[PDB]
Amino acid sequence: VLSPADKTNVKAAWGKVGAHAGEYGAEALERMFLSFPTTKTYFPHFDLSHGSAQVKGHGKKVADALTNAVAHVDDMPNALSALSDLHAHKLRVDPVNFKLLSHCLLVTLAAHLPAEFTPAVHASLDKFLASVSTVLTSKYR
Amino acid sequence: VLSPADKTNVKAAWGKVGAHAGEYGAEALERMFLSFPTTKTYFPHFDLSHGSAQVKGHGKKVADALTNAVAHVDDMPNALSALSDLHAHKLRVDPVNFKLLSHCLLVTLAAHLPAEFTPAVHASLDKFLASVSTVLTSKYR
Amino acid sequence: VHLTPEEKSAVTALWGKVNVDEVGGEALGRLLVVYPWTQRFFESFGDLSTPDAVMGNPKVKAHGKKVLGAFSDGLAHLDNLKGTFATLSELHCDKLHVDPENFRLLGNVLVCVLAHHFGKEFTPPVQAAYQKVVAGVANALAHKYH
Amino acid sequence: VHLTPEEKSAVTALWGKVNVDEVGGEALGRLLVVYPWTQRFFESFGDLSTPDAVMGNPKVKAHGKKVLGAFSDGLAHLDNLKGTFATLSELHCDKLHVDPENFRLLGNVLVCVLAHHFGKEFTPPVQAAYQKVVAGVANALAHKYH
Ligand code: HEM
Ligand code: HEM
Ligand code: HEM
Ligand code: HEM
Incomplete structure (x- = not known):
C-alpha cells in the first residue's frame, strides 16, 4: 500500500524519464537478461543481443506501461487489467522474475538520475514497483 | 489482487468459521510458535505454553481483525490502518512471518473444516491472507 | 533433519x-x-x-504419485537429504530452473493436504515435525542453488 | 562464486x-x-x-564500514566465501535469526548504491558480475540455514 508521500515521490521521479522511456526500459531489460539469464526463457524467439532493436522496442512498451500505472496509481488493477491477463493468465510468469526486473529498473534509475534517487524516493519506487508486480502476477477477472 | 469470485469464496468460508473464529486464531498462533520457533521473538513476555489463556486471548483478537477485514474486503487499507501502524511501524514485523502465520491459519482451517476447504476456497483464502499481510506490512499514513 | 524419537x-x-x-x-x-504460475512447468499435462x-x-x-514417493524416500533418509535428492536437485535447478521458493510452496501445500485428511490427528506438534521434514526436502532440492 | 578473469x-x-x-x-x-522492518535488528543504534x-x-x-569490509573480504577470496563468512553466518543465523531474504536485499541495495555512485560506468556486464558476488555473499551468510 502506497502512502501519499510515496505517490508524490513516484510521480516526481518517474516524471523525469520523459522521452528516455524507451532507453531506460531497454537498459532495464538488458540488465535483467544479463544478470539473471533464466529470465530469457520467457522470450524464446526474441533477439536479445546487446543493442537489439527488438529489446529497444520492448523497453518502450514496459516504460509506457509504467507511465500508465503512475497515471492510475490509486486504481491500478483496473488500469492494468490487460497486462495482468497477459503476464498472469497467458504467460504464467513466476513472481520472482518481477523482483528481478524491478531491481534492474531501480539500478537503471539510480545510474541515470543521481539527484532524484534519494533514500526516500528509492523506498517509494521500490514499493511502487512491488505494487505493479502484484497486479501483473494476479488473476482478478 | 482478489477476483470478485475470490471475495465471495472468502466471505462464505469465513462465515462458516463463525463462532469458532477465536478458537481457530488461538490454534493458528500455537501452530506458528511450535512449527516456527523464531516467531516467538515477537512475543518475548508472553505465556506461550499449551493452553495459554494469553495466547487464547490473542487468538480471538487476531480472528476478530480478520472478520473485520472480510467485512471490508474492498477497502482493507482504510479498515486496517491502525493495525498496519502497529505491525509495520511499531513492531516492525519481518514480512516472512506473515507468510508463516497465513500458512498456519490455512492448516487450522483445513483440519477443522475439511469439506469447506476445497482447492478453489484454498486458493481464495491464500490470496486473501496475502492481501491482509501486505496491508499490515505497509506504512501508508 | 533431526527429529526427537517422539x-x-x-x-x-x-x-x-x-x-x-x-x-x-x-x-x-x-x-x-493455488499458485497458477506453476502450471507453466506442466504445459504437456x-x-x-x-x-x-x-x-x-x-x-x-500420476506425476503426483512420483512426487509423493520422493517425500516417502526422504523420510527414510532424513540425515542424508542432500545426498538422496542430488539427482532431483540437478533436474529441478539446473535443467528446469524452478525457482526454489516453489519447493517451499509445494511442501506447505502437502502439509495442508495432510491437515485436511487427518484433522484432529494433525496436531500442532505433529505439524511441527512435518514442517522440519518438508523444509529439509525443500532445502535439499534447492541445493544446486546454494 | 565462479567469475571469469575478465x-x-x-x-x-x-x-x-x-x-x-x-x-x-x-x-x-x-x-x-527501504525495508523498514530491518530496523528491528538495530534498536541500540x-x-x-x-x-x-x-x-x-x-x-x-560506523556499522556500514564493517559490512563493507566483509564484502571486501569476500572479493579477496571468492573461491572460499563459505569459510570466510562462517563466523558471520553463525551470528546472523543462529544468534540473530535474520531471515535470509534480507541478505539478498542488502546485496541488491549495495548494487543500487554502486550504480548511483558510478553512473554509466556501472554497465550491465559489470552489474552482472557484481550480482554473482552479492549472491555468493548472501548464500555464504545463509549457510547455517542450509
Ligand atoms: C513492471 C513489470 C512489467 C511491466 C510493466 C511489463 C509490461 C509489459 C508490456 C507493456 C508488454 C507488451 C504487452 C503488449 O504487447 O500488449 C509485455 C509483454 C511481455 N512481458 Fe512484460 N512487464 C513486466 C514484467 C515482466 C517480467 C518480469 C517478465 C518475465 C521475466 C515479462 C515477460 C513478458 C513477455 C514474455 C511478454 C511478451 C513478449 C512477446 O512475446 O511479445 N514481463 N510486458
Ligand atoms: C493476518 C495476520 C495478522 C493479524 C490479523 C494480526 C492482528 C493483530 C491484532 C488484532 C493484534 C492486537 C492489537 C491490539 O489489540 O492492540 C495484534 C498484535 C500483535 N501482533 Fe499481530 N496480526 C497478524 C500477524 C502478525 C504476525 C505474523 C506477527 C509476528 C510474527 C504479529 C505480531 C504481533 C504482536 C507482537 C502483537 C502485540 C502483542 C502484545 O505485545 O500485546 N502479528 N495483531
Ligand atoms: C518440493 C518438492 C518436490 C519434489 C519432492 C519433486 C519431485 C519430483 C520427481 C520425483 C520428479 C520425477 C523425476 C523423474 O521422473 O526423473 C519430478 C519432476 C518434475 N518436477 Fe518436481 N518435485 C518438487 C517440486 C517441484 C516444483 C515446485 C515444481 C514447479 C513446477 C516442479 C516441476 C517439475 C517438473 C516440470 C518435472 C518434470 C515433469 C515431466 O516429466 O514433464 N517440481 N519432481
Ligand atoms: C547480507 C550481507 C551482510 C553482511 C556482509 C553483514 C556483515 C556484518 C558484520 C561484518 C557485522 C559485524 C560482526 C561483528 O562485529 O562481529 C554484522 C553485524 C550485524 N548484522 Fe549484518 N551483515 C549482512 C546482512 C545483515 C542483515 C540483512 C541484517 C538485518 C536485517 C543484519 C543485522 C546485523 C546485526 C543486528 C548485527 C549486530 C549489530 C550490533 O553489534 O548490535 N546483517 N553484520
Whole structure:
C-alpha cells in the first residue's frame, strides 16, 4: 500500500524519464537478461543481443506501461487489467522474475538520475514497483 | 489482487468459521510458535505454553481483525490502518512471518473444516491472507 | 533433519495412513490451483483450465504419485537429504530452473493436504515435525542453488 | 562464486574506487529506509525515525564500514566465501535469526548504491558480475540455514 508521500515521490521521479522511456526500459531489460539469464526463457524467439532493436522496442512498451500505472496509481488493477491477463493468465510468469526486473529498473534509475534517487524516493519506487508486480502476477477477472 | 469470485469464496468460508473464529486464531498462533520457533521473538513476555489463556486471548483478537477485514474486503487499507501502524511501524514485523502465520491459519482451517476447504476456497483464502499481510506490512499514513 | 524419537514416531504413524495413490496428486493439483504460475512447468499435462480440470487430470495424479514417493524416500533418509535428492536437485535447478521458493510452496501445500485428511490427528506438534521434514526436502532440492 | 578473469578484473577495478568510509553506511542506511522492518535488528543504534536521521546516524555509518569490509573480504577470496563468512553466518543465523531474504536485499541495495555512485560506468556486464558476488555473499551468510 502506497502512502501519499510515496505517490508524490513516484510521480516526481518517474516524471523525469520523459522521452528516455524507451532507453531506460531497454537498459532495464538488458540488465535483467544479463544478470539473471533464466529470465530469457520467457522470450524464446526474441533477439536479445546487446543493442537489439527488438529489446529497444520492448523497453518502450514496459516504460509506457509504467507511465500508465503512475497515471492510475490509486486504481491500478483496473488500469492494468490487460497486462495482468497477459503476464498472469497467458504467460504464467513466476513472481520472482518481477523482483528481478524491478531491481534492474531501480539500478537503471539510480545510474541515470543521481539527484532524484534519494533514500526516500528509492523506498517509494521500490514499493511502487512491488505494487505493479502484484497486479501483473494476479488473476482478478 | 482478489477476483470478485475470490471475495465471495472468502466471505462464505469465513462465515462458516463463525463462532469458532477465536478458537481457530488461538490454534493458528500455537501452530506458528511450535512449527516456527523464531516467531516467538515477537512475543518475548508472553505465556506461550499449551493452553495459554494469553495466547487464547490473542487468538480471538487476531480472528476478530480478520472478520473485520472480510467485512471490508474492498477497502482493507482504510479498515486496517491502525493495525498496519502497529505491525509495520511499531513492531516492525519481518514480512516472512506473515507468510508463516497465513500458512498456519490455512492448516487450522483445513483440519477443522475439511469439506469447506476445497482447492478453489484454498486458493481464495491464500490470496486473501496475502492481501491482509501486505496491508499490515505497509506504512501508508 | 533431526527429529526427537517422539517426533519420528508421530511422523511415521501419520504417514502410514496416507493414501499413496491420491495424496501426491492432491498436493500437486492444489499447487497448480493455488499458485497458477506453476502450471507453466506442466504445459504437456493437458487441461489445467479449472480447479476441477486440474484435480481430475490423470497426468497430475500420476506425476503426483512420483512426487509423493520422493517425500516417502526422504523420510527414510532424513540425515542424508542432500545426498538422496542430488539427482532431483540437478533436474529441478539446473535443467528446469524452478525457482526454489516453489519447493517451499509445494511442501506447505502437502502439509495442508495432510491437515485436511487427518484433522484432529494433525496436531500442532505433529505439524511441527512435518514442517522440519518438508523444509529439509525443500532445502535439499534447492541445493544446486546454494 | 565462479567469475571469469575478465569479470573478476572488472569487479576489482571498480571496487578500488569505492569509498571505504561511506558506501557501506549508504547501503546499510538505505536498507533501513527501504525495508523498514530491518530496523528491528538495530534498536541500540539510536535515531532511525526518518530517512535523514538514518543516513546521518553515526552508528549506521560506523556499522556500514564493517559490512563493507566483509564484502571486501569476500572479493579477496571468492573461491572460499563459505569459510570466510562462517563466523558471520553463525551470528546472523543462529544468534540473530535474520531471515535470509534480507541478505539478498542488502546485496541488491549495495548494487543500487554502486550504480548511483558510478553512473554509466556501472554497465550491465559489470552489474552482472557484481550480482554473482552479492549472491555468493548472501548464500555464504545463509549457510547455517542450509
Ligand atoms: C513492471 C513489470 C512489467 C511491466 C510493466 C511489463 C509490461 C509489459 C508490456 C507493456 C508488454 C507488451 C504487452 C503488449 O504487447 O500488449 C509485455 C509483454 C511481455 N512481458 Fe512484460 N512487464 C513486466 C514484467 C515482466 C517480467 C518480469 C517478465 C518475465 C521475466 C515479462 C515477460 C513478458 C513477455 C514474455 C511478454 C511478451 C513478449 C512477446 O512475446 O511479445 N514481463 N510486458
Ligand atoms: C493476518 C495476520 C495478522 C493479524 C490479523 C494480526 C492482528 C493483530 C491484532 C488484532 C493484534 C492486537 C492489537 C491490539 O489489540 O492492540 C495484534 C498484535 C500483535 N501482533 Fe499481530 N496480526 C497478524 C500477524 C502478525 C504476525 C505474523 C506477527 C509476528 C510474527 C504479529 C505480531 C504481533 C504482536 C507482537 C502483537 C502485540 C502483542 C502484545 O505485545 O500485546 N502479528 N495483531
Ligand atoms: C518440493 C518438492 C518436490 C519434489 C519432492 C519433486 C519431485 C519430483 C520427481 C520425483 C520428479 C520425477 C523425476 C523423474 O521422473 O526423473 C519430478 C519432476 C518434475 N518436477 Fe518436481 N518435485 C518438487 C517440486 C517441484 C516444483 C515446485 C515444481 C514447479 C513446477 C516442479 C516441476 C517439475 C517438473 C516440470 C518435472 C518434470 C515433469 C515431466 O516429466 O514433464 N517440481 N519432481
Ligand atoms: C547480507 C550481507 C551482510 C553482511 C556482509 C553483514 C556483515 C556484518 C558484520 C561484518 C557485522 C559485524 C560482526 C561483528 O562485529 O562481529 C554484522 C553485524 C550485524 N548484522 Fe549484518 N551483515 C549482512 C546482512 C545483515 C542483515 C540483512 C541484517 C538485518 C536485517 C543484519 C543485522 C546485523 C546485526 C543486528 C548485527 C549486530 C549489530 C550490533 O553489534 O548490535 N546483517 N553484520
